[PDB]
């Protein structure tokens, strides 16, 4: 559990100057051309492209993404000692008062207004993105259903992803707090049912073929991340979900929650991954499109490679979790 870098509580008076830098580097990649990777938007497009849910990648996906972005915050902030500090829903069921504040709130005019400016400005970078994908990339995209960016767009129009200004969220400043289904679904008496299981898939969600491939899910994945993403409305209710900063917050405290699992596990001499002919079915699974701090594609491109916190160099203040 050493590390250089340490995730803390958003409630935590010694996270408040991390919020601040957060705030410092939506601004910056709110500015940058969508000819940048680190672009807010082409960010957010990552997630889009490649993001697992309802299955077992659904935890090292998140680490994976969570970590990159977190030092791309790290760069375009200048504050070197950055790391994204987590929402514990368990301990504050509501949207955070810190995240209506400036460019926390995607309703912010910093942030893109509407479908027809989105489209405007991503649709060449898109393209362009499509048009340098590997084989490898392309049969991903194939996975996905995606035969062309176009298909991405549909996705983006038809379900929809994208939600003008005074839509970013459903929760509001005023009214923060969540529904009784997903105050229950963070709840420490779920969370505790949640951390409970003794094997990766019963705790991360079912086995597939491939991450695009929807399966049975597990508690961490079904009730406090689903209902939570829900909930707040908005982008966060889709596949355009890291346009809200919010989200890497969420996501702070689901890979928290993971490092708790681990933790238990490793205690009680149980196993912390998937094991014998699953390890490297789910180790080797191809996470081909993340965006290392520089805008460059990363080297670091299977999931066995974002199996533990490893490079990435972090711990946690200790946040809700399992009955000591
Ligand atoms: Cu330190
Ligand atoms: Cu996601
Ligand atoms: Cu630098
Ligand atoms: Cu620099
Ligand atoms: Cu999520």
Redesign the pocket.
């Given at each position: 559990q050493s590390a250089k870098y340490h995730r803390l509580n958003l409630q935590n008076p010694a996270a408040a100057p991390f919020l601040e830098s957060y705030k410092k580097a939506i601004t910056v990649m709110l500015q940058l051309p969508p000819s940048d990777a680190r672009n807010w938007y082409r960010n957010a497009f990552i997630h889009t492209l490649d993001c697992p849910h309802g299955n077992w990648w659904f935890v090292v996906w998140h680490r994976g993404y969570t970590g990159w972005f977190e030092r791309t915050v790290r760069?375009?902030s200048?504050d070197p000692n950055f790391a994204f500090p987590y929402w514990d829903w368990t301990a504050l069921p509501q949207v955070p008062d810190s995240f209506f504040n400036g460019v926390l709130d995607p309703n912010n005019p910093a942030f893109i207004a509407s479908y027809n400016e989105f489209y405007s400005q991503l649709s060449n970078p898109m393209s362009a993105l499509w048009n340098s994908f590997s084989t490898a990339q392309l049969q991903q995209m194939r996975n996905r259903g995606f035969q062309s960016v176009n298909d991405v767009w549909q996705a983006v129009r038809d379900s929809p992803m994208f939600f003008p200004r005074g839509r970013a969220r459903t929760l509001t400043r005023q009214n923060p707090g969540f529904d009784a289904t997903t105050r229950r679904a963070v709840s420490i008496g779920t969370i505790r049912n949640a951390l409970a299981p003794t094997d990766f898939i019963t705790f991360g969600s079912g086995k597939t073929a491939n991450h695009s491939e929807s399966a049975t899910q597990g508690i961490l994945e079904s009730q406090p991340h689903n209902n939570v993403h829900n909930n707040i409305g908005g982008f966060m209710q889709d596949l355009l979900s890291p346009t809200d900063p919010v989200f890497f917050a969420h996501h702070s405290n689901i890979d928290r929650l993971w490092d708790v699992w681990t933790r238990k596990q490793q205690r009680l001499g149980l196993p912390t991954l998937p094991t014998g002919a699953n390890l490297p079915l789910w180790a080797n699974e191809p996470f081909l499109f993340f965006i290392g701090?520089d805008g460059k594609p990363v080297a670091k491109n299977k999931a066995g490679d974002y199996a533990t916190i490893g490079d990435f160099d972090y711990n946690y203040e200790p946040g809700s979790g399992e009955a000591v």
């Open positions: 760069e375009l200048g701090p």
